[PDB]
Amino acid sequence: ITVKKLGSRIGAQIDGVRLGGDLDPAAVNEIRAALLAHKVVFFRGQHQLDDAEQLAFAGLLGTPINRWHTDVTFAANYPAASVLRAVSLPSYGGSTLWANTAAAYAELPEPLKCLTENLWALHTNRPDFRTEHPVVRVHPETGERTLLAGDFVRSFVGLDSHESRVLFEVLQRRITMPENTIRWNWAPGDVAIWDNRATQHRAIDDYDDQHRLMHRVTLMGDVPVDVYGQASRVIS
Amino acid sequence: ITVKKLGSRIGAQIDGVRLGGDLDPAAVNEIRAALLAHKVVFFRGQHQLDDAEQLAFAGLLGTPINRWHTDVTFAANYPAASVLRAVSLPSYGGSTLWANTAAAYAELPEPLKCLTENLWALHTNRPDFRTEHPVVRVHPETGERTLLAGDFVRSFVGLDSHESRVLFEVLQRRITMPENTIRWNWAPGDVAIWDNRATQHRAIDDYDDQHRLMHRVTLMGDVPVDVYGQASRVISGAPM
Amino acid sequence: ITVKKLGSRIGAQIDGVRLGGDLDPAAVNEIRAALLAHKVVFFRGQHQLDDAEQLAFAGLLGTPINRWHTDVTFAANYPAASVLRAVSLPSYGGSTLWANTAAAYAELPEPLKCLTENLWALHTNRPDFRTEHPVVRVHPETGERTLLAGDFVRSFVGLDSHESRVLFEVLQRRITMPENTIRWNWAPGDVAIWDNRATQHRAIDDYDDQHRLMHRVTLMGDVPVDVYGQASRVISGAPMEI
Amino acid sequence: ITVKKLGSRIGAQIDGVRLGGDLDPAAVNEIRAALLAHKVVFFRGQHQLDDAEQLAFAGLLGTPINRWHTDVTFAANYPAASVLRAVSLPSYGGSTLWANTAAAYAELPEPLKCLTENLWALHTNRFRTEHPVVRVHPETGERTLLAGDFVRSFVGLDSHESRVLFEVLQRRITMPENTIRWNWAPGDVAIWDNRATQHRAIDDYDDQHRLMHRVTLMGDVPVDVYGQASRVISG
Numbered sequence: 004i005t006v007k008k009l010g011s012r013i014g015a016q017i018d019g020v021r022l023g024g025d026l027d028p029a030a031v032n033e034i035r036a037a038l039l040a041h042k043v044v045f046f047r048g049q050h051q052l053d054d055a056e057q058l059a060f061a062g063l064l065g066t067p068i069n070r071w072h073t074d075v076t077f078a079a080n081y082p083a084a085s086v087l088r089a090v091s092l093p094s095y096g097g098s099t100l101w102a103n104t105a106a107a108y109a110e111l112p113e114p115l116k117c118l119t120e121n122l123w124a125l126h127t128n129r130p131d132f133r134t135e136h137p138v139v140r141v142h143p144e145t146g147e148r149t150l151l152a153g154d155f156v157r158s159f160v161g162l163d164s165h166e167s168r169v170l171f172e173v174l175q176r177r178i179t180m181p182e183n184t185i186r187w188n189w190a191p192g193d194v195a196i197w198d199n200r201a202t203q204h205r206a207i208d209d210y211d212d213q214h215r216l217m218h219r220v221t222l223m224g225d226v227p228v229d230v231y232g233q234a235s236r237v238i239s
Numbered sequence: 240i241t242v243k244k245l246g247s248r249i250g251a252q253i254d255g256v257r258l259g260g261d262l263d264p265a266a267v268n269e270i271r272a273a274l275l276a277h278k279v280v281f282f283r284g285q286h287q288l289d290d291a292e293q294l295a296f297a298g299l300l301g302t303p304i305n306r307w308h309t310d311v312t313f314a315a316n317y318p319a320a321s322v323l324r325a326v327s328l329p330s331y332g333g334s335t336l337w338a339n340t341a342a343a344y345a346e347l348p349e350p351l352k353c354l355t356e357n358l359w360a361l362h363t364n365r366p367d368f369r370t371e372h373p374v375v376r377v378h379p380e381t382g383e384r385t386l387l388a389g390d391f392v393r394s395f396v397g398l399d400s401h402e403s404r405v406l407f408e409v410l411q412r413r414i415t416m417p418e419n420t421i422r423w424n425w426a427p428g429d430v431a432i433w434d435n436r437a438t439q440h441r442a443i444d445d446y447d448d449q450h451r452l453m454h455r456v457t458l459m460g461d462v463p464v465d466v467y468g469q470a471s472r473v474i475s476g477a478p479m
Numbered sequence: 480i481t482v483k484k485l486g487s488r489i490g491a492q493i494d495g496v497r498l499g500g501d502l503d504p505a506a507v508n509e510i511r512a513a514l515l516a517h518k519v520v521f522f523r524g525q526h527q528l529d530d531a532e533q534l535a536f537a538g539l540l541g542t543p544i545n546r547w548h549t550d551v552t553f554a555a556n557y558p559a560a561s562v563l564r565a566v567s568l569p570s571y572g573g574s575t576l577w578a579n580t581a582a583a584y585a586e587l588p589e590p591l592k593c594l595t596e597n598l599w600a601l602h603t604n605r606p607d608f609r610t611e612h613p614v615v616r617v618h619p620e621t622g623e624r625t626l627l628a629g630d631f632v633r634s635f636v637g638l639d640s641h642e643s644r645v646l647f648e649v650l651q652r653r654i655t656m657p658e659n660t661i662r663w664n665w666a667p668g669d670v671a672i673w674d675n676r677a678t679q680h681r682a683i684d685d686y687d688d689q690h691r692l693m694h695r696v697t698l699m700g701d702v703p704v705d706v707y708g709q710a711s712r713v714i715s716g717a718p719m720e721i
Numbered sequence: 722i723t724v725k726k727l728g729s730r731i732g733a734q735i736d737g738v739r740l741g742g743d744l745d746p747a748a749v750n751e752i753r754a755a756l757l758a759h760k761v762v763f764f765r766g767q768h769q770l771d772d773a774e775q776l777a778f779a780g781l782l783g784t785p786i787n788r789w790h791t792d793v794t795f796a797a798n799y800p801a802a803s804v805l806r807a808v809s810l811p812s813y814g815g816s817t818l819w820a821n822t823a824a825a826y827a828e829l830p831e832p833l834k835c836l837t838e839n840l841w842a843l844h845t846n847r848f849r850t851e852h853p854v855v856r857v858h859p860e861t862g863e864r865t866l867l868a869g870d871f872v873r874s875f876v877g878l879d880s881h882e883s884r885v886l887f888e889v890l891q892r893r894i895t896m897p898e899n900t901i902r903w904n905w906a907p908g909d910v911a912i913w914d915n916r917a918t919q920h921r922a923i924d925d926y927d928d929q930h931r932l933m934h935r936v937t938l939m940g941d942v943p944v945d946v947y948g949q950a951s952r953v954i955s956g
């Protein structure tokens with residue numbers, strides 16, 4: 004079970020594993036360890052997988068349930084991870100991006116850390132769901148500080164509309180800087196696992212009207228907490 | 240001596256005082272108190288003041304030496320205050336703007352305080368002066384925090400070009416909010432005194448190609464210190 | 480009747496006129512001419528005016544009915560001008576800002592004219608009025624081109640959120656530039672008249688929470704037309720009546 | 722001899738051709754067509770190349786001489802295309818991005834076309850040259866956005882506006898749907914049309930070594946839609 008490093012700050016490929024429900028404990032711990040470290044992990048050659056096999060494999064890692072986003076951040080208890088499989092890919096394009104929000108934080112100048120540590124964003128959906136998340140959250144498992152932003156961010160608490168947009172785009176520019184991202188060229192039998200609590204992702208609509216079907220199993224999450232132990236606030 | 244507020248966050252007009260080199264200590268203590276409190280103070284009908292009589296008066300406040308700026312912040316020990324007198328005005332226009340950078344800091348959300356308190360800016364003169372000032376200085380006399388920025392800020396330390404211009408303009412917008420500024424319509428024999436340690440100012444070129452003349456006496460200042468007690472840093476040049 | 484510039488781009492003071500319904504028709508022509516030329520005009524020491532006499536004077540100019548805005552641009556036929564009179568001023572502060580959107584357009588570099596001439600904007604009251612105005616309207620009387628924007632602007636047609644807000648701030652920066660504005664220190668008896676088809680205005684809340692009250696009389700305006708001659712489009716809400 | 726589409730707006734892979742001076746002109750015409758259509762073209766498994774044989778193939782196209790840029794736009798007669806080859810790659814990362822500035826222009830809302838057609842940018846290195854923001858491509862006749870990180874300012878606009886409009890343009894240009902990210906493998910060769918693209922290196926390999934051999938071709942002076950050519954300030 005080798006783990007190939009793809010990029011300096013994000014992405015790893017994992018060889019010598021056949022994803023499925025009947026897997027070894029020691030194997031799973033290598034996967035989680037690689038997931039937490041590299042934020043998104045990839046599995047080639049997984050042509051054995053159907054839905055039920057992918058769902059059973061997800062059950063080991065946790066509890067099963069365009070533009071840059073963390074999935075469902077308008078909700079308070081937003082997903083921990085996702086297992087995504089290709090079933091039907093187009094003849095060209097259809098690649099996907101991931102960004103490491105843990106490394107994003109780490110590389111912030113200390114002034115911007117000061118800012119973000121104490122900053123809170125209003126996440127919403129465009130049935131109206133509203134959550135105030137901290138822009139910085141501590142990762143339950145790794146204890147890493149990770150920026151929490153993305154396209155569900157409506158505004159920052161306290162700041163006016165102009166300041167919100169401007170500061171928002173400042174963070175996203177760092178979060179999605181090419182060095183801090185990985186772009187995956189999907190082939191059949193590929194499976195990506197990403198930590199939704201330390202990443203943003205983005206689909207790319209570069210395959211025209213071609214069909215592109217994927218199968219996604221999303222693991223259960225938990226309410227974020229900032230560096231002062233403050234958890235997220237609900238409204239709607 | 241009576242002092243009248245002009246706006247809620249800045250400006251005061253002081254009557255009952257003829258400015259000159261020979262003034263009562265108690266009176267100059269009331270002027271300074273008003274200057275520190277209101278950041279800019281205006282004197283009507285000071286027709287007796289010529290260059291020499293102005294220079295004298297300024298010497299009771301300290302030691303004698305268009306875009307929103309704080310005067311000469313590309314130097315480490317930039318001036319504390321200035322006395323500006325009108326002599327030849329235009330027939331219309333030619334007002335001047337002042338911004339209270341102390342009230343600006345106070346109005347900030349806590350997130351932007353965190354930022355500004357720890358943010359440091361490189362001020363330059365496009366002689367090659369270069370100075371790393373804090374974005375927040377503690378005022379030597381009032382102890383108030385004041386935002387230190389303006390048109391001499393080339394960049395912020397640790398941030399790139401884009402982040403800099405972005406945050407620069409975010410700060411300047413809050414500083415130059417109309418409610419945090421005052422526009423002075425110059426009449427002849429008007430004298431303005433402003434605290435350069437707690438303000439920005441801007442001249443308005445709305446008098447076409449008419450002649451304009453003012454007389455400025457600028458006072459010696461000290462090196463700023465951040466909220467932790469760290470001084471500004473001379474990269475190039477020498478103190479004033 | 481004298482009319483005095485208060486600035487190169489905007490503002491003028493008019494003295495030598497007792498305002499009221501019994502005004503000399505030739506004097507009204509000079510008022511109107513000044514208003515169109517200088518965008519906002521001020522009268523000092525008009526202590527004789529009241530609600531009734533102001534409304535009467537207004538009727539000679541046209542038909543009667545904080546942050547930078549043109550008045551009620553969320554409607555299609557937004558006012559042509561307004562007459563504003565002080566009744567009760569605070570002891571300090573309370574000054575008001577005007578910006579010249581005609582001068583603003585004139586100063587635009589050619590590329591930015593290309594953009595603005597061809598740019599439309601959705602205005603809204605944040606009742607549910609929603610209107611697509613041109614960012615440049617041709618002025619009925621003067622024939623001048625004026626930038627039409629302000630705080631009611633929600634977005635620009637054909638452009639996404641980021642682009643819209645970015646370009647919006649580009650224009651507002653030019654409009655509200657100090658050179659292109661005037662700030663009025665209100666005294667009792669002061670009256671201000673401005674052309675709402677060629678200006679934005681902004682109240683300044685720099686008087687804490689002291690008591691302030693003005694009285695305003697607003698005139699009827701027409702629907703803006705772009706340089707090509709296309710008129711503003713109503714999406715929701717009725718035009719202004721009376 | 723086949724050419725495969727990599728993404729809707731940009732990117733092509735050309736398989737079944739050995740690059741070098743020893744190539745049928747008929748193949749060169751099929752390669753040039755792809756380069757003009759797809760803006761960047763990729764050759765897998767070109768293990769048998771070297772500095773001499775890359776240069777010979779570059780001559781068949783024309784006349785031989787990190788952040789989002791078009792190469793050497795501070796110059797006026799800046800390059801037409803480049804042939805880049807991997808000689809020694811890091812163990813991980815080292816990818817490169819290309820953006821299609823022709824597709825960028827086409828996607829613009831009509832108001833932004835008004836602007837960009839009439840807009841001019843001062844390009845510089847930290848030489849100086851005033852280029853049109855929209856150039857007409859000499860071969861294809863397509864209108865392409867011309868910007869990148871050599872742009873200091875736009876002619877007639879102040880610093881703030883220039884800066885703020887610049888990011889509006891670059892944001893569209895570098896929109897993922899308009900780009901391609903290439904994972905470099907041994908013996909890979911890319912040719913890109915520098916007149917219709919931007920490119921960006923990705924420094925995501927810590928302190929590792931990515932040696933690349935580039936061969937750049939001669940390119941003519943840009944012209945705007947009105948026919949006005951670029952003005953040189955500092956030659």
Ligand SMILES: O=C(O)CNC(=O)c1nc(Cl)c2ccccc2c1O
Binds near residue numbers: 550693
């Ligand atoms: O005092 C002033 O600056 C004049 N006020 C206005 O033009 C004005 N405009 C609008 Cl759109 C509103 C809108 C709502 C309430 C008061 C308003 C107002 O006084």
Ligand code: NI
Binds near residue numbers: 073074204
């Ligand atoms: Ni998603």
Ligand code: NI
Binds near residue numbers: 308309
């Ligand atoms: Ni100055």
Ligand code: NI
Binds near residue numbers: 548549550680
């Ligand atoms: Ni109004």
Ligand code: NI
Binds near residue numbers: 790791792920
């Ligand atoms: Ni290059």
